[PDB]
């Protein structure tokens, strides 16, 4: 009913939204900003490809499966084509396999929001356990995600992200708490900023 | 079969097993790898040398190391026994290994020296010499055995030190010792 | 490796020479070719020695599974047919033999070659020496035949075959499948 | 699993498919008109947070040289359905060597959506999608729905408030109308219920160019 | 599949209950010979009096009575015949009753789809002489001396308890089944209300003709 | 909620947690990352010669994960040559641990186990793997029954410059305070040369003393 | 490769004697090998043809007879081996085991058993058989002095012995030390 | 999933339900006439807008015919396959054994349900044989049997009463007990080597009218 | 509701495994003790020849005992063939844990509810190993399984058995069993045998 | 896992499968259809599901055989696909056009397999087969949505099948019809079944199967002819 992925009488998958609520209960609060020249992400940082990274947000265990799948597909791209998979193509493909969880009632949605960053200019894709992906301009996903989105809508890039996490989680950080990853025009190499 | 070393010897010393072998891995008339060490050291004592296509030695060196490494965290006779299973199984598909290996190991006062032919023929023998000494070294081994029926620490030692002079002289002289596992 | 068989009004007689060979060396002269499957029907062995044993062990097995399940006898027609099918599958594998199904049913003699040639005649000789065995066979054979005259005919025809075939030596081994079923009618010598 | 999650109700109704039709009732409105120069398809999409992108995932995805799709329903499901629709079209091109007839691609894709109303362990596709095409002398406007039932149309609407959108399409429009003129009824029927648009004509399938949508 | 909270499986114990709606069957072992016996289990009069069968051959030396779910029995029976002939083909000796029964026990609870309801009584005179192995549907075989299987069998078990004899004579042991089958049955036993089969030490297994049964 | 594929409405799968409870019952293992080496103690499995493992949670299941980890170390040694790094081993075994959580049919693991390895480049590494497939590095780990109860005394320790040599006694000491106690201890540090091995019996007897 | 096997049993003895040496081509490699491995107090099996196969075959025979010994908990009959081994040879026949094996298990009747084999399976109870390389040399002679004897054992030992003296100085693949394994009711008598 | 798991009763659910499913079938009377077999069925439910497995074996299934043909097809493949393996044709008994084994199989299976038919397999050997087979996989020889709706009452009608005369039995059971139907009834005598042969309704009037005289 | 093998109890562990323990109790008792000379199975008639020097004693349902045992024989032959030595007992017991492991971890597959006592002669000195219905097995100085073993265990705290040899062991094994006697002895002098 | 499975192959304690009963009831939701045999040809009237203005069931199984699909549309297409395959495979190896009775048995085998095993939903769609097999001439068959088939001289299926087929019981006289009488009765019953007294051209469409000059041809009626039959209807009223 609300246990096997099937439609409710409202035409709504229950298990999918449960997976969104599981992302919110993952307790982490990721934000990314697409500058013109740089693509900050902040929170679980990953290097899916040397030119591509992403931050999963949700269930901790669940993140690693889709990280490995992302590396599998990203590597397989270059194997059949021979150029970096675009951030759009990678997010598209991972979204396409997250739908498989939803189409099949056997297996369950992995609750991890996937904020990709990387230059194809800079890209900030979102992915949901729904199988929905879209390019945002300044995404955030997590617990205080809505409270951050307002501050993003109101809106140096690194500052946007860090002041956003500071103001929105309403806490002054330690540098170890905020892991930050930048992908500058000149640095297509995924790299943790290291404030 | 691709590049092939030859000339592996083995023979026991009372409380030890000398096994010497030269270090050539010739491919055709050319001696392409005048650097290969063919005497793997299996266990705190026991060891295999190999004389046949070297690719097969690499395969069985990493695979025999798999069996020993597994079992350790779970005897020469056993290694030869399985080795006969491995050489045999590859023969059954007619995809053999070209390796012919002597397995010298001191086990409980007994110097087992197995010989495993590529086509899976197997026996223990006290004075084993694999190819090119399987017609040349072999009488030199026996001539000592025709006279004295056993060989001492010093006897088999000097026997191999001379017999290897009877390839190139660069041979490593592995020596199982009551302890086991030496190489010179 | 000669195994004559013929049927007449008082039986089906199946005689066989006992020599078996590898090269021009003769390993033994003791084999009884007419491998048993059934009290009242019997096999033969021509062609390679191991093949006939094995196939007729499978045959004996399948005839037994059949007689238990169907709860009736397997017939010479059916027995030869299951046999013929089973040897066909191994056609091109060189599993060569000249087994024959014999037995009283009227009498049934069906020659069964390894390539699947299950033919029903009445008069056969199978094997290397068959060409010798045939010529003697026709000359005495009549359906009007006594059990004794037929015994002599089987023995003469085997005796004349072994006399010329280098690879066939050993004693004649009659089995007579009369109405009731087979008996070891003679195992008697050729060196008489 | 191996057991289908589609089973009849006591009077013979496919409950899960009916619920899939409820999922079609959601999703932003779609609209499509066969005019006589060429079909147009258009859909509401929204800024929503004002941080979105509009060229990222069009609901208007070309499928084949002159076919396109517009969906209403769940967006995630569309992304894979399109993939199989393109598969059928390219596969058809290597076997038959002509871009596949509009009616045939709609049929084959309908069969894909039918398979899950009989297939184990899978739910039916929520997405319903207009499939608009033009071959030979005719513009084709099709509607595939969750059960894999499909219909050709002269004008049709999907998503939220299709119920009134179709009503406008039968009175505000009929017969024929020059392609932008039959886009007039699109932009004004869609108005009853940001926006993406794509047109067909005979000029290679096309997204109505953004300066001219304005 | 579910081990009950009280240990033992469900479907098996339900299969044991299925035996209770199966024919009564004495499994006499005389040390001379084997005497498997079973009530005809006929109830319907235009149902044939000589085509209904309860006891089947396996080898020439092993008979096999059955009880419980009659249809289910024939699968395990046919596979037992295949096993015995396979033994003959590989080793030329006939398969002894202990292993003939064991092979069938191996297949008994292989449901990873549902357990057989059959109780079986192999009787085969093998070099040891008479042997009589009962087989439970729990995948348990047990050597026996006298076990009677089926529905009124519990009373046949206890009746057997007084009359079981050290050694035993072949004909006398047969008479025991002929008397006990009148008790366990509701009707007065008639030779068309039993199908007896016996194996004397020297003979190959014989279904018993009816005329002999009246005596 | 009772089947693994289903999510409870709030945001978790309760099956995984019920499987987690199993290690909350079983008695404390305690490994301690140290200036060199990880002294596993559990009031042990040679995963590889390189790697040691200290299981907690029901033992039956724990052995299968041990055997898979031995397989994983061997496939890595064959395909790549070089002895497996623990930072990759943890992640691989943890991935395999994770797969169960995702499908209804197989049950989540009961175990949680700290594998550890001293190696030259990495130095000591002490990773614990949860039955969820969440593996993290540690400076100390202690899991089981006395779960935070052991953690207060490994917090009392300050290994960062404690030698492995104090720790071989200290693990047993922490075991004694949180705890009759059968004692087990392991040394993997550079004196043991990365050979996963039980403590020498005299020091182990002294440690219980 | 090859080498000679011989076996005779009349009365209780099943004298399975064979030369030790194996020759890979001509390079006699060990002069100490037995061809007549013992399997059971009664079972002894000569194996000539191909040593590499002989090893593998006898290990398969030993494994299978132990499986039987578990499966029936009854000792493996010599007659069971005669019917069993032939099927084992047939199992790998399209790639065949180049092996000629002579069986010597002690019967239930306390008598000798000899079972000749070929590479595809021809078990033969017989009063004697020699297989292997020198078999052509030994069969007519050995047949003549053995085939109204009560199977005299002392003269029979000399008769087994002498023919291998004769084969060894005639055929170049029979030689060195002779190993004999009589099988009597007291057990195998190596 | 195991379907026919044992009840706590010791019964099998699907099997007993299948026993009640053949009871809804029509009254497939049969009797093994000493001369020749005769069999027949009834209740065609004529709106007026409206088997043989061998030349020996024939079948008169009762139950749900939807399943019954599907059983007989596999049975017919089994007949012909047997004629190629043994030289002679299949005996009626061997057919009955296979059909009974085939029906048994689906109870012990994943996802299957017992075939709801109970076939009156019939056939010459030249002695008549008149088997019943029931969903359980039990097969019993009979000399009279009738399976169907009200057929049980007919078997009892036979029990107290048991070419023209065997046909009189087959008619009498139906034209006395079941509703009188000169077309509903379709008896077919099988002659010794003539294939099971139906009659025209007027030829059936040999007793369909003579019973009106009796 | 934990009537499935896969399911874990909110309260605790898988209930089918626990119910498999109770499956052991309807089978008759069997006692395993040992001395350095000989291992001692005593079974209240169940002893089987697993190997020429190993024998199991079943308790519980017979079916699972034979299934495990048919595997045991093949596994004993594996070590005896591949490596040419007797199988060491402890390794075979480790295989029992591996084969019993699969049902507990999987669905639709019930546990091997037989409890076994694998006595064997061994080169480290004879060992006996109980294997419980879960994979878990125990090295032990002495042990008892089956019905009423608790009385039999109680006798053993006061018990001498590692010193006194096989005759006296068995004399006391019968005394332990009182708390119809098959006996299974193996030792350095003699192969496993069913007295 | 399998705890969800509702079986849908189960056998019920009332002794009649669930999905089969539900399949019968699905068709009642399906719109009216009827086929009428004659001694020269076989008609198939069918009613276009709604008259809806802006939308711009019978199929070609062969050129000598055709089907009407009633119960549902999405499933029907797969049925028609399988019918075309079976027919054209039979035409492939036997090299003669499939006899129609056979083609029906084949599809009904495929249907029956869905009830019998696999735990998959059955096709709920009753079909008609109009055709002219070589061996029997013109024939019409109806496929129940569980395996069955019944050669019928006239039959209706869809909404009010019962009233319509019962109306044809007495209104279809046996063995007298020239094709003209088939058109008359067709138009009658389809007229009487709807609450609309007469029917519009966007309601009926009639595939007449006619032996066209020694080459049998199926033809959907051309709408101008559909309206002469309807225009005749207005005066038949």
Residue numbers in the entry:
A (entry chain A): 10 to 52, 68 to 144, 148 to 182, 193 to 231, 235
B (entry chain N): 4 to 77, 84 to 175, 183 to 200
C (entry chain L): 1 to 105, 108 to 194
D (entry chain B): 5 to 197, 206 to 226
E (entry chain E): 13 to 124, 134 to 236
F (entry chain G): 8 to 50, 66 to 201, 208 to 237
G (entry chain M): 8 to 154, 163 to 205
H (entry chain D): 5 to 54, 63 to 137, 140 to 176, 184 to 235
Q: How did the manuscript describe this experimental structure?
A:
The proteasome comprises a 20S proteolytic core that in eukaryotes is formed from seven α and seven β subunits arranged in pseudo-seven-fold rings, two copies of which stack into a barrel shaped α7β7β7α7 assembly of about 750 kDa. The proteolytic active sites correspond to the amino-terminal (N-terminal) Thr residues of the mature β1, β2 and β5 subunits. Accordingly, the 20S core has limited proteolytic activity against smaller peptides and unfolded proteins, and full activation requires the binding of regulatory complexes to the α rings at the ends of the barrel shaped core. The proteasome is a well-established target for cancer therapy due to its critical role in the highly regulated removal of cell cycle regulators and to its inhibition leading to apoptosis, primarily of fast proliferating cells.
We determined the structure of the human 20S proteasome core bound to the inhibitor adamantaneacetyl-(6-aminohexanoyl)3-(leucyl)3-vinylmethyl-sulfone (AdaAhx3L3VS)12 by cryo-EM and single-particle analysis. AdaAhx3L3VS is a highly potent proteasome inhibitor that irreversibly binds all the 20S core proteolytic active sites and can be modified to serve as a proteasome label and as a reporter of proteasome inhibition both in vitro and in vivo1216. The vinyl sulfone class of 20S core inhibitors act by covalently modifying the proteolytic active N-terminal Thr residues17. In the cryo-EM map of the 20S–AdaAhx3L3VS complex, densities are clearly recovered extending from the catalytically active residues of the β1, β2 and β5 subunits, with no analogous densities visible at the non-proteolytic subunits. Here the vinyl sulfone group and the three leucine side chains are clearly resolved and arranged on alternate sides of the backbone in an extended near planar conformation. The remaining Ada and linker components of the inhibitor are only partially resolved, most likely due to conformational variability, and were therefore not modelled. The density extending from the N terminus of the β2 subunit is also consistent with an extended near planar conformation of the L3VS groups. On the other hand, in the closer to physiological conditions used for the cryo-EM sample preparation presented here, where the human 20S core was incubated in solution in the presence of AdaAhx3L3VS for 1 h at 37 °C, the inhibitor binds to all three of the active sites in a manner consistent with the results obtained from the in vitro activity studies using purified 20S core.
